[PDB]
A paper describes a structure:
Non-structural protein 14 (NSP14) is the main 3’ to 5’ proofreading RNA exonuclease (ExoN) of SARS-CoV-2. Point mutations in the exonuclease (ExoN) site of non-structural protein 14 (NSP14) compromise the fitness of betacoronaviruses like SARS-CoV-2, implicating NSP14 ExoN inhibition as an antiviral strategy. However, there are no advanced compounds that inhibit NSP14’s ExoN activity. Building upon the reported crystal structures of two fragments bound to NSP14’s ExoN site, we identified a series of 3,5-disubsituted pyrazoles that bound to and inhibited NSP14 ExoN.
Because XChem screening uses “PanDDA” analysis to identify density from even weakly-bound fragments, we sought to validate the binding pose of the XChem hits by bespoke crystallography using a small set of newly synthesized analogs of **2**. We observed identical binding poses, and unambiguous ligand density (confirmed by Polder OMIT maps), for all four fragments. We also validated the presence of two conserved hydrogen bonds to NSP14 (Asp273 and Gln108, **[Fig fig1]**). Neither **1** (pIC_50_ = 3.4 ± 0.1, n = 4) nor **2** (pIC_50_ < 3.3, n = 5) potently inhibited NSP14 ExoN in a biochemical activity assay, while the isopropyl thiazole **3** (pIC_50_ = 5.6 ± 0.2, n = 4), the alkyne thiazole **4** (IC_50_ = 3.8 ± 0.2, n = 5), the alkene thiazole **5** (pIC_50_ = 3.6 ± 0.3, n = 5), and the cyclopropyl thiazole **6** (pIC_50_ = 4.3 ± 0.3, n = 9) were more active. We confirmed on-target activity as recommended by others for NSP14 inhibitors by demonstrating that **12** and **13** neither bound to substrate dsRNA (by thiazole orange competition assay, **[Fig fig2]**), nor inhibited the unrelated endonuclease RNAse T1 (**[Fig fig2]**). The unmerged fragments, **3—6**, were also clean in these two counterscreens (**[Fig fig2], C**).
Numbering used by the authors: 26 to 61, 67 to 94, 104 to 121, 153 to 367, 376 to 455, 465 to 520
The structure:
Amino acid sequence: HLSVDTKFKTEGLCVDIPGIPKDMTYRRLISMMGFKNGYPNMFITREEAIRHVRAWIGFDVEGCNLPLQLGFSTGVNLVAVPMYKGLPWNVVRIKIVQMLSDTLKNLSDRVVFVLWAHGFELTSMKYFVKIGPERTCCLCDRRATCFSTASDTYACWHHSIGFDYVYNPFMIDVQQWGFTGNLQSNHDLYCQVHGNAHVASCDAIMTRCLAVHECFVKRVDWTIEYPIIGDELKINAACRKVQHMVVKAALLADKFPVLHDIGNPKAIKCVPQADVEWKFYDAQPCSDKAYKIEELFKFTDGVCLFWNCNVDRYPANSIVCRFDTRVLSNLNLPGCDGGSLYVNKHAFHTPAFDKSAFVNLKQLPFFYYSDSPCESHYVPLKSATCITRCNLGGAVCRHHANEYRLYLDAYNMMISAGFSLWVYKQFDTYNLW
Ligand SMILES: C=Cc1csc(CNC(=O)c2cc[nH]n2)n1
Ligand SMILES: [Zn+2]
Ligand SMILES: [Zn+2]
Ligand SMILES: [Zn+2]
């Protein structure tokens, strides 16, 4: 945890707060913010913030004493008076709780406000924030993130309906990391997808994007592990199953003499009984721009497997699994320059999906293939895509009907999680019969 006696640089704040001391600790800062047990500091370290990336909410307040525009990286702008029209703080804070609860309940057990701090945002916290000792929800065992003055009760993000204060938020000022120049000039160095439209929400979006760029694009820590909040395990199991299925059938159908497996340096053979000559080539997850095939690269013999090795243009003799950054899920967070921050056990920033990368390939059709014995150890199954000896013979046996439906469920899970599959144009399932 971050010592409250650590120094906070105040130069960023001196425009909204003329005369602010240069010599400043977090202790004195919190006191100036109007605030006074498991919550040692409202501010956290970059390391703590990285561990709670899912909780990150970029936050900016803009002035014109007169009204204030509060912007958040969700896209919401609220106007408080002492896009939405001006309203007093006692109704504004109700909206802040509802918005953070709906955004974060399926993501994290807290909120981390990510700031490019110039003053108003920090002096505005006293109007919708309360702090105190760590607590638990009144209705469950999750830690409390909201408080209600109507009933003097605490709630987590799931049980906060009607609550009016944010309780024990965390926060981090990006301007402490040692930057030169304003927010827009540092953000626009790495990103063109987020504009500067002179609304507070635009600043909040840029601030979070810059943070993510610094902590996951330029710097990368794959040792950090993140809790399970979803179907992580079923998704990862489904990916290994689809990988085995698709490569096995591609070898059986086209009988490539060699396979170039390009990507993770710890990859293992996904079809260990295949006759082919299996050759590995090491590349780590690219976090910034897609690899250039010319730098990566007889790759024109046999087939190339690119299983989450994002390249700019796949060769024509490839099998490919590429993550689609546009997908909406609790695992996939907005990232930098169209990229997305996929957090499933580990945090993988991923360059933006680009359909031109697949120009030499086609989409891979669903199919189930099996050469296993028809032995069991219900509604009868009818499908043209169940490629088994039994379907060839007229009637799908029960074992293969069960496995087909399991494989379809895993296939559909992996697609819905954002993954997309692409194959060489000559792939043809008829060749497997
Ligand atoms: C209603 C009060 C109010 C205050 S400021 C504002 C509009 N926001 C900006 O001009 C701005 C500058 C940087 N980001 N946003 N509205
Ligand atoms: Zn609860
Ligand atoms: Zn950006
Ligand atoms: Zn069968």
